[PDB]
Design a protein around this ligand. Structure first.
Ligand code: OIX
Ligand code: OIX
Lengths: 304, 304
């Protein structure tokens, strides 16, 4: 028992981390096979950042200007190309530590592990969610660009995120591994509206099921609700509307606990309307939305 | 910016994880050099667990009875010995992936990363603290025994914990890597008093400094206090007494923020006496005590 914000083991990803330097800027790259992927803003200086013309800036750079270092050894760059907001540096050596991997575009509300890196060196690993507004509430400092988010299924690493910038609001924005930003964000130093965020309702319900599995049951009540009634409450409290697809994804947890999804919705409705009254659930004094139903079952079943 | 419950990258530790089977019991072992370390209860059946005579049970076992598998390959056991509550299985092959490492006994209130494992395979990594009462609030299921806790300084892994059991209360107990239990716990299936836990005051203060560094400042007030006055409040709220050694450890964060330690104590006193009033600090609705002053500076400085 016990329920923690558990990240995937970061080993397979640590072996892919490299340092990429261009001019005076250094950030992290992801070395998979004979390609190094990094944020395209590695080619910017500081006068550039307000509105960079990436095409023009990249034209001034040659393969030899991209310094790629994997631990203590230098990689030879034999090609460079820009795909959306990422640079793809072809190197002459395939990474011997390349795990089985895929590039995936995650959906808002899904979770992933982030391996925070500086100068191509891993400093820490944490679990987070892609917010409904396509920002991530990460922990990143100067030099963390190129740090990636991922999920792992047995031996396959599904890379879903590459860190690009921190918005003036202190939340983080980045791309999928094809360089497409999640959300409306652009790789420019300008004020960018993140847009209204909501709480990931299906995740809160999954976490409420995790609480019951792990002994915390004080919030269970004698009530039930309908999807429509629950969604009126979800709207008032800036929660995402619950759909039957979400009820269906919660099926396994409902069967495990014997608590119907709509019955758990009525518990959540009561917690939203009455608060926690100074109590806690799984060591938290607020409703947690960074665990998916899959994460709850994975953590409660011990999938390696 | 941003502040997360960040774990150390688990790669160096993943490379040490093996599966140890003895009779019908399978758990995890830690393979460092030519030694595999695992909990001694691997030799117990089920009738044994209520009060095992470990010496007698081990006498019936021979080197060939300990099956040690590292991924897909079998390790040859050439020696076995019991040191406190751990078994040390000498193998004929030194682990090629052995990182630089030390075995350390952590102090209560200190933090560490746990790599949860099942069948010698890593499933996840999370950060936690050794509670003042020498339990850990982990996330462990059947088969997680032998999973370890550690800290990493540059290239050196300091192993501090090996998981042994879950108490009837749902909290976890284990040993240092010499097999000495943290706390009064014994490796028997009996009810064991964990003893009164307290909140790690120096850690809450460190986390309050992290909040200020990351923009959350609503809790800063116009007050100050003395160590004696603060400790009367800490006693009432089951917080550990703050000592000058704790004030000294908070020195760097006090200099960084320009907020005197006793001034931050007065903020903490007010939060303890008035609660949060429905507000949050670093995404938490309670006072967090699982970040040490060293962790706060490490996360806020990007040490790799
Ligand atoms: C506004 O910056 C950019 C805009 C567009 C494109 C790139 C921008 O950044 C480039 C450098 N950024 C970082 O290294 C950074 C990343 N995350 C967290 C941080 C926290 C404090 C200081 C810096 C960072
Ligand atoms: C009372 O058990 C023991 C007592 C003394 C010595 C050993 C004991 O356990 C041996 C097996 N234990 C585990 O595999 C275990 C570890 N953590 C979390 C769990 C959650 C649910 C079920 C089992 C576990």
């Amino acid at each position: 028992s016990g329920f923690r914000k558990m990240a995937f083991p970061s080993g397979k990803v640590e072996g892919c981390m490299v340092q990429v330097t261009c001019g005076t800027t250094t950030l992290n790259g992801l070395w998979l096979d004979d390609v190094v992927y990094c944020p395209r803003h590695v080619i910017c200086t500081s006068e550039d950042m307000l509105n960079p013309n990436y095409e023009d800036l990249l034209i001034r750079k040659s393969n030899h200007n991209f310094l790629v270092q994997a631990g203590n050894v230098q990689l030879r760059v034999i090609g460079h190309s820009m795909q959306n907001c990422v640079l793809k540096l072809k190197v002459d050596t395939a990474n011997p530590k390349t795990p089985k991997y895929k590039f995936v575009r995650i959906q808002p509300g899904q979770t992933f592990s982030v391996l925070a890196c500086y100068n191509g060196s891993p400093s820490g690993v944490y679990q987070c969610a892609m917010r409904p507004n396509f920002t991530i509430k990460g922990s990143f400092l100067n030099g963390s660009c190129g740090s990636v988010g991922f999920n792992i299924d047995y031996d396959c690493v599904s890379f879903c995120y590459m860190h690009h910038m921190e918005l003036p609001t202190g939340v983080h924005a980045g791309t999928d591994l094809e360089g497409n930003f999640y959300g409306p964000f652009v790789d420019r130093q300008t004020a960018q509206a993140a847009g209204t965020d909501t709480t990931i309702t299906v995740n809160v319900l999954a976490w409420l099921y995790a609480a019951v599995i792990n002994g915390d049951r004080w919030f269970l009540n004698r009530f039930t609700t309908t999807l429509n009634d629950f969604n009126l409450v979800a709207m008032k409290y800036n929660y995402e509307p619950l759909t039957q697809d979400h009820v269906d994804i919660l099926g396994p947890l409902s069967a495990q606990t014997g608590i119907a999804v709509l019955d758990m919705c009525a518990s959540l409705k009561e917690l939203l309307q009455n608060g926690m009254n100074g109590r806690t659930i799984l060591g938290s004094a607020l409703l947690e939305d960074e665990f998916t139903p899959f994460d709850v079952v994975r953590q409660c079943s011990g999938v390696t």
